[model samples]
Target: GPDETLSLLADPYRFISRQCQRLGANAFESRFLLKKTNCLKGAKAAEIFYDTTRFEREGAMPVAIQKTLFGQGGVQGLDGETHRHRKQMFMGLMTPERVRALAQLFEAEWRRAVPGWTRKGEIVFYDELHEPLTRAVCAWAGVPLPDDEAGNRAGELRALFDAAGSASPRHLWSRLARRRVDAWAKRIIEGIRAGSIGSGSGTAAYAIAWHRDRHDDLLSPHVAAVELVNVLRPTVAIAVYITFVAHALQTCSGIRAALVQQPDYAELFVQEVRRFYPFFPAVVARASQDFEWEGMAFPEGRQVVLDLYGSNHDAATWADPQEFRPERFRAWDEDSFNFIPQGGGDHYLGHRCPGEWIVLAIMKVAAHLLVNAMRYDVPDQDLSIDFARLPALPKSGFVMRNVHIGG
Candidate 1:
């Protein structure tokens, strides 16, 4: 089984693109060979990926990732019982009750800008809408807005991250961003040392600070700070999803009309957006042991890439995979595997994003606002992805004009 699989860990991009091409642009099958498949000594990759394995041993790769990003004890990167314990800290933090409470913040942010839009009569939503909402998440997350000194560094940090291509870059910018996040983390640790930071219920940072203080562990402070950076950085990046959603609304007027007529179908609409858009292209998982599936063998310690876009669009999993139709989910009673946006299986367990609940809640509220309260011309459908760029924003920043309420 191990000899049959061609491990792609050596050439990630080629591996992914090839899989996408052969897999019919929607879904494909692969196998894993765990060095020790706690299940009968050796189990098929398909068995682990398909939820058939008895042991929760499937997530060592993502858990390692969590450990690398946040620290050794960070929850997102832990396995089984350890991961569950870490995730519990975020339970009430993202509950529906908490989501409802945070709606006021989202609503306030929306209302604050509605008046400004009325004055200008036109606004570039990607920048205007995305930036403000990101700031709001930061405010709620207990990250104090940097003063002048910190503000200057923040700009540098943004540039560095943006310049460093998502894959590889030998440029100094990549190094700079890494150094910046680490240095900023040290400052947060210093704040904790001085007792300048305290726990609060509103923001993730406050919650983390409380957790660290409660644990009385030295590593807790570092973990808490990295948690803040990881959560806040992604909160803004997720705005790309909002831009894609707006694009969908503009392109699919029929869907828009349905949304207008049947407001109850909003959740379905969001799910479809998650499916159709190419968010994170692939999630990385490493082989813990040799495995095989679909006439292939994966050697131990090899990397396996889960093609998320391909999975969402797989013809085997979804009917008419290329089309954008929300009703399909509305009609089904299947689990999350059928429609994964944030991620599926154990990979999501590694996510350090405490704002996921708030993010979804905000999306629902903002979609309603766009559908009901705001109206504007749609961008050119031809404004598409440039493979060379990061996160595939429309070429012209999704230009749209001509404002009016939908009648």
Candidate 2:
């Protein structure tokens, strides 16, 4: 027998996003259980989505399942001691010294990748710049660059990461992907053990390795490898931001002029991009325990999603919220409740996006490079579009074909 309910939920990519909007954030509290349909089978049981806090405490199914991808130590899947130790290891790895060392490597890679593009009359910035930039980050981390076969398999592995919560362990495709990931992990760990990886002065991931060495705990090389790979997804998401920034620079020369005038504002400009145009629309959490708050009753087991997009766009919190204003945050003061591009509450700590500062740094530098070093034309594709479907690149990966500077 096939699980019909789960199948239905899994078929379309936007199912969850659609459901969240229709039901509202607190719909689970209305006693209306959302049924998860499996296409292979019939109707599966209706599942309740409750308060996020309860989900975290009770150990929700999604959280449990995420462990397979991120390993047991991943902050997203673990709680209490399990969560804390992993977070510490991540923080150690992303320290100033480590990040700076990695930045040098990234800069070198960027220099090499950038030159070939100027040679071409027009470069599809996403594939040429963003993709290779992400690969450069992988290089800095200990993960071996996939040989031809692994390179081909990267798409399948990425799909597994994308389908993480949708498919169950028993699903054949999901299971196979898990096996591949596990095998990949084992090889990466073996590399660390064999002294071929996680070494060298400029190596960024060494901090994580150092922390693991000190703890002598359950921090396996598999966990290290996953974390390293995990770092790339968000890093690559920068492609979207980079494209948008370029568009802004092309159309809105004032913004570009401002950056050139005040080189120090480069960091602030990048932060504004993240604040105004976040890549992820929502942040998800499962209920850990039943609790009531603000006149709302939440059940023991359910999924709670925080609308990061909503929070960022809330008019009450931001002046001209919809506008792309980088200078607003210069001396801005508001409740932590607002301006949450990541998420709110204790879940914020679990957002092990330690690379945020580094991301801002990279984007600012890249923007500065484009602003001063080169010039480009704004394409017609730059339009107000759905944020949910976007990865770190412009619409159509921004196919701008113009070239040259002050020529």
Candidate with maximal TM-score: 1
The C-alpha TM-scores of every prediction are 0.74, 0.74
* Per-candidate clash tally: 15, 31
Name the TM-score of candidate 2: 0.74
lDDT of 2 by residue, 87-146 (tens): 666665566776665566666666665556667867776555544555666676656666
- Which ranges in model 2 have alpha carbons more than 4 Å from their true place? 1-73, 143-182, 201-204, 207-215, 251-253, 334-337, 344-349, 382-384, 388-393, 402-407
Instruction: Tell me the tens digit of each residue's lDDT in model 1 across 1-407.
Output: 34322344343223443555665442233444443221110112222443412223345544323323332344544455555555555654676765675666656766666655556765666655644554565556655554334444444334432444444543355455555665675576567456786535665665655553224454455566665665555555556667777777877768878888886788888778877876555544455556665545556654555555556666656768789898877776645455545555443344333555666677777678778877677645456644345455555556656654442
Q: What is the lDDT of residue 256 in candidate 2?
A: 76
RMSD of each: 6.2, 7.1
User: In model 1, which range of ten residues has the least summed lDDT?
Assistant: 36-45
Give lDDT: candidate 1, residue 249.
Answer: 81
